[PDB]
Amino acid sequence: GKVHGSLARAGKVKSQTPKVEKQEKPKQPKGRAYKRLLYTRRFVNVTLTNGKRKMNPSPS
Amino acid sequence: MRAKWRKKRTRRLKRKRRKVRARSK
Amino acid sequence: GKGKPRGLNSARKLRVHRRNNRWAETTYKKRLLGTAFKSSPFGGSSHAKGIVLEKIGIESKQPNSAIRKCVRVQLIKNGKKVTAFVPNDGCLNFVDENDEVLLAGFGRKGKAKGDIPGVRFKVVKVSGVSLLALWKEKKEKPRS
Amino acid sequence: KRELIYKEEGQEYAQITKMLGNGRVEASCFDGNKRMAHIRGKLRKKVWMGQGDIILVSLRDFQDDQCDVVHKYNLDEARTLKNQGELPENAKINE
Amino acid sequence: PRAPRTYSKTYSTPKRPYESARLDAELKLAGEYGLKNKREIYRISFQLSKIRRAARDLLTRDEKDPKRLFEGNALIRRLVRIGVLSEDKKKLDYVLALKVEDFLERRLQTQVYKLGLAKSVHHARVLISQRHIAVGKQIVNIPSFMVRLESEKHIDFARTSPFGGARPGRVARKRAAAAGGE
Amino acid sequence: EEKGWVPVTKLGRLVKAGKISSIEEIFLHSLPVKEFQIIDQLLPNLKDEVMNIKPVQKQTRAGQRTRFKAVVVVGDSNGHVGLGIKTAKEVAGAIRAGIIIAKLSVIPIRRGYWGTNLGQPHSLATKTSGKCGSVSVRLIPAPRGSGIVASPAVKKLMQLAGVEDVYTSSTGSTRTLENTLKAAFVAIGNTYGFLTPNLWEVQALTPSPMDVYADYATAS
RNA sequence: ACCCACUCGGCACCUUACGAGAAAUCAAAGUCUUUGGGUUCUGGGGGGAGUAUGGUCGCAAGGCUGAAACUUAAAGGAAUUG
RNA sequence: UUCGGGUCUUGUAAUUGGAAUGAGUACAAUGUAAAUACCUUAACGAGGAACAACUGGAGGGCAAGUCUGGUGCCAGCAGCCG
Ligand SMILES: [Mg+2]
Ligand SMILES: [Mg+2]
Ligand SMILES: [Mg+2]
Ligand SMILES: [Mg+2]
Ligand SMILES: [Mg+2]
Ligand SMILES: [Mg+2]
Ligand SMILES: [Mg+2]
Ligand SMILES: [Mg+2]
Ligand SMILES: [Mg+2]
């Protein structure tokens, strides 16, 4: 109908969201290695010189 | 409202409170 | 030239003029009158514990339509009663009635924040445990 | 012609006794509950209601004093409710 | 009640923490010299700011003033001894002209890299951190060891290190033992 | 690219003929510049930066007719600045006309020394100030290598100027970018408007370039 | 009593910005980031509120002095186009 | 001549090798009034080097998404605008 349940119930969206498990990953290096990775990714491996840097460019 | 009439209403409230106090002074 | 005197022997009136004008501020007046200790729910206190009396929700303003889940808490330090906000999504059920809850400031200098009317305090801890640890299931309520 | 929506797991019907201001209403819920009803979303200024109107309202389990009105029936789906009889029939509400 | 010894802060975070150009410059300097955090750049900028404050205060004072002479040449000799200020410009007005990269350059990290015994800046960082480089038969496990001019000629791998000549180490010794056994 | 630039002004004609060699001749005799190509000819390396794009609306009977105000700053980082402010329908056209005005309004600045003089000037010569709207900008000389202590827009203006070290202080509603940049422009162009002891001796009033070279103008 | 010229003082007025302002405008609202002639009073966002209380004056009306709790993201000034 | 060797370098790949090292344990000795602990150092101690770095945020202010799914003025977010 208009509303699928009791409207004012607390923790509604949290309760009914689909629990999607964390995706397992390779370890992300931390510390000086992370700064080196960022430096390589931004100032020696310039990817999209057009426009801005556009870090995290949405895929479309 | 105008400031004039707000002032006058305040004066009338003071009227009532003053007569009440005078009756009980 | 200007309103203030300028002579070399006018320190007295300059000082007293500044001292009389300082009361025009709000921070200085609050600090010197010490209204925080006498009138505010906490006397110069960042946090304070209290007991949950009942479990209320309060509607928002015009531009924002919702009901923010609050809680009425009587402070233990002095006995005052204040409404407080249970911050996150599914935290209303976490805090049960008549349990000790540590209220904190709401971040807007003791004034209502956002669209929630007549509230000035968050909720940080309940029954000794923090709400943020409960909300991510890092800890659980002791249920005593 | 639209299908009439029944209550489910907490929502219940009621009748407006007197409508207050600032989007507030006094509603008699048919459990002997002279409750306060709050005009709510999808209901602010899209559908209008008045005194003595059949109403559907969701409760709040953390406070039973106030309750949030959700859907209004147009005096004909009210008749359908009346024949199927989920609400008490000891009340006459006609035109 | 014992007399305290004074701890003191050695850095100062910038007031605008979110400047795009400044963030990019900080990342450039971090990647160029293998700095672990951006607190390193803050520390060098704080040292430079103290140096500049002293230099400007001495500049305000009149020329040929005992304070100016004494502490100005003291700061000059200290900076040339560090090596950041070239001998050409011992004037106390080129002191105001130093850049943060100048002090960055004198780190034991970059000096080990320059000497070539470490072929990469991060290689220099790890080699320093593994207790290998010794500045005058004294190892330094600290990348920010400001190498002074009088002692730069004495950087080399330590004797205790395998590179300077000693037992190889855990992995090589274990492999040799395994080969000898089988 | 394609550029003919038939000169319509006598100054433009002289520049095209190659008779004016330095922009200092233009600034000295207070000549009026109306062709942006003159400034392009004299300063080949005028970089720019679009400071702000602002949507400005006019309420008509049908909807709200919206244009865009571009605030462009042009300069060469060697003591030459210009501040163009333009309004146009399309943003790209707004920026083009804004840089165009900015090139038209180039101005020289007088960089000086904070203390003793050792190398090239690093800061301004004296304290200067300007005021546009309610925004008053005060530029104050700073010791060598002190950076540009200024808000990002004013900082970019000084960087385009070539001033490497300077202190600033702004009073008013410095929020509005056009007012702040115009006030800073007034101050930095006023730097050459302050008589200083090292600028006291009189000169010989060298004849105007369009007087000595009037023949090469007046297209016949 | 007029006419012409000048001067002192007064209510004023026209033009203008070469000065000042957020502007409307001001010959002072100028000589203010190039900030200091002397001096008195007043204001520190809006509301609550010129309310309560306490003094004091008054026959009375009311005058003078005069907050806070709390609430609020604006209230307001000048001007532009509709 | 399309090439194209990559002639010269710089990254990306659960490919693949050899090194170095502590954080930990621990003979000792130093340390200490006696002991910890630190400095030194035997013998062990890295492959997913699982010896696994979090805390906040991704509309603006303010660096970083108009990607996917969920909820649809609810739940909630939001210091302010939203
Ligand atoms: Mg309402
Ligand atoms: Mg006020
Ligand atoms: Mg008032
Ligand atoms: Mg009284
Ligand atoms: Mg108005
Ligand atoms: Mg995270
Ligand atoms: Mg978030
Ligand atoms: Mg997200
Ligand atoms: Mg951004």
UniProtKB/TrEMBL annotation, chain A:
A Pfam family annotated for this UniProt entry: Ribosomal_S30
Domain of life: Eukaryota
GO BP: translation
Residue ranges crossing the lipid bilayer per the database entry: none
CC annotations in GO: cytosolic small ribosomal subunit
UniProt region (Disordered), positions on chain: 1-34
Keyword terms: Ribonucleoprotein, Ribosomal protein
GO MF terms held by the record: structural constituent of ribosome
Record family assignment: Belongs to the eukaryotic ribosomal protein eS30 family.
Descriptive protein name: 40S ribosomal protein S30
Species of provenance: Kluyveromyces lactis (strain ATCC 8585 / CBS 2359 / DSM 70799 / NBRC 1267 / NRRL Y-1140 / WM37) (Yeast)
Automatic annotation (TrEMBL), chain C:
NCBIfam families documented for this protein: PRK04211.1, uS12_E_A
Keywords: Hydroxylation, Ribonucleoprotein, Ribosomal protein
Organism: Kluyveromyces lactis (strain ATCC 8585 / CBS 2359 / DSM 70799 / NBRC 1267 / NRRL Y-1140 / WM37)
GO biological process assignments: translation
Family classification: Belongs to the universal ribosomal protein uS12 family.
Gene Ontology cellular component terms for the protein in this record: small ribosomal subunit
InterPro entries: NA-bd_OB-fold, Ribosomal_uS12, Ribosomal_uS12_euk/arc
Protein name per its UniProtKB record: KLLA0B11231p
Any GO MF annotation of the entry: structural constituent of ribosome
TrEMBL record, chain E:
Alphabetized PROSITE patterns for the sequence: RIBOSOMAL_S4, S4
GO biological process: ribosomal small subunit biogenesis; translation
SUPFAM superfamilies associated with the record: Alpha-L RNA-binding motif (SSF55174)
A single Gene Ontology CC term: cytosolic small ribosomal subunit
Region feature Disordered, mapped onto this chain: 164-182
The keyword rRNA-binding appears for this protein: yes
CDD domains named in the record: S4
Entry keyword set: Ribonucleoprotein, Ribosomal protein, RNA-binding, rRNA-binding
Gene Ontology MF: a single term: structural constituent of ribosome
Coiled-coil region(s): none
Domain Small ribosomal subunit protein uS4 N-terminal: 5-105
Pfam families: Ribosomal_S4, S4
Domain RNA-binding S4: 106-170
InterPro entries: Ribosomal_uS4, Ribosomal_uS4_CS, Ribosomal_uS4_euk/arc, Ribosomal_uS4_N, S4_RNA-bd, S4_RNA-bd_sf
Description of how the protein assembles with itself and partners: Component of the small ribosomal subunit (SSU). Mature yeast ribosomes consist of a small (40S) and a large (60S) subunit. The 40S small subunit contains 1 molecule of ribosomal RNA (18S rRNA) and 33 different proteins (encoded by 57 genes). The large 60S subunit contains 3 rRNA molecules (25S, 5.8S and 5S rRNA) and 46 different proteins (encoded by 81 genes). Interacts with snoRNA U3. uS11 interacts with MPP10. Component of the ribosomal small subunit (SSU) processome composed of at least 40 protein subunits and snoRNA U3.
Family that this chain belongs to: Belongs to the universal ribosomal protein uS4 family.
PANTHER family, per database record: 30S 40S RIBOSOMAL PROTEIN (PTHR11831), 40S RIBOSOMAL PROTEIN S9 (PTHR11831:SF5)
NCBIfam families linked to this entry: PRK04051.1, uS4_arch
Protein name: RP21
Organism, as annotated: Kluyveromyces lactis (strain ATCC 8585 / CBS 2359 / DSM 70799 / NBRC 1267 / NRRL Y-1140 / WM37) (Yeast)
UniProtKB/TrEMBL annotation, chain F:
Binding site for Mg(2+): 83
An annotated Gene Ontology molecular function: RNA binding
Keywords linked to the UniProt accession: Metal-binding, Ribonucleoprotein, Ribosomal protein
GO cellular component: cytosolic small ribosomal subunit
Domain S5 DRBM: 46-109
Swiss-Prot/TrEMBL GO biological process terms: translation
Domain of life: Eukaryota
Family statement: Belongs to the universal ribosomal protein uS5 family.
Protein name: Small ribosomal subunit protein uS5
Organism listed in the record: Kluyveromyces lactis (strain ATCC 8585 / CBS 2359 / DSM 70799 / NBRC 1267 / NRRL Y-1140 / WM37)
Range of the intact protein held here: 36 to 255 of 259
